[PDB]
Design a protein around this ligand. Structure first.
Ligand SMILES: Nc1nc2c(ncn2[C@@H]2O[C@H](COP(=O)(O)OP(=O)(O)NP(=O)(O)O)[C@@H](O)[C@H]2O)c(=O)[nH]1
Ligand SMILES: [Mg+2]
Length: 168
């Protein structure tokens, strides 16, 4: 019974924990801020095939973390998340991409570029074409999400990484 180790990375504040908790626990809690990384594990059915999804919500803190390096090293696919209301997080997407391809020592590896917080329409600084242009440049899928209820593409984001892994 296959296990897909997934890693969520991206700048501080982009929604990594929000997206993750929305996926597993089906909730949005504005006040929830975990300082340290959490992992999560659930059976899940993607296109009629069950899998265990084993997901790390990375915490981007400066200190060394044993768990985090394990997941980075053994991970099957990454979600690279930025926030559409934080232009810096989008500029810093290159850091993450580059980081993932070194740890893995590969030319490509299963990733999705995740443009989050698209409910905050009046604060949107990164446009849809900008994000798609950048997806294209790395040749990886682009998806827009919102962890907030009712969420958008949160389930699809996770299943789509699995899909990417599977059909690779
Ligand atoms: N409206 C809206 N708020 C969101 C969305 N995703 C996250 N937020 C909010 O934005 C803030 C930062 O969320 P958080 O999930 O902790 O970000 P993070 O990526 O885990 N940052 P860190 O690296 O510090 O853990 C929180 O207030 C959270 O409620 C979203 O899609 N829409
Ligand atoms: Mg977090």
């Amino acid at each position: 019974l296959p296990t897909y180790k997934l890693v969520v990375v991206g700048d501080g504040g982009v929604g990594k924990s929000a997206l993750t908790i929305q996926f597993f626990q089906k909730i949005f809690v504005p006040e929830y801020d975990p300082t340290i990384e959490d992992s999560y594990l659930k059976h899940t059915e993607i296109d009629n095939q069950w899998a265990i999804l084993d997901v790390l919500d990375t915490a981007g803190q400066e200190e060394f973390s044993a768990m985090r390096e394990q997941y980075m090293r053994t991970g099957d696919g990454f979600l690279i998340v930025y926030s559409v209301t934080d232009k810096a997080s989008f500029e810093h997407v290159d850091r993450f991409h580059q980081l993932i391809l070194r740890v893995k020592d590969r030319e490509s590896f299963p990733m999705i570029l995740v443009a989050n917080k698209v409910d905050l329409m009046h604060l949107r600084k990164v446009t849809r074409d900008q994000g798609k242009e950048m997806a294209t440049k790395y040749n990886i899928p682009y998806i827009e999400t919102s962890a907030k209820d009712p969420p958008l593409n949160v389930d699809k984001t996770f299943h789509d990484l699995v899909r990417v892994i599977r059909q690779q």
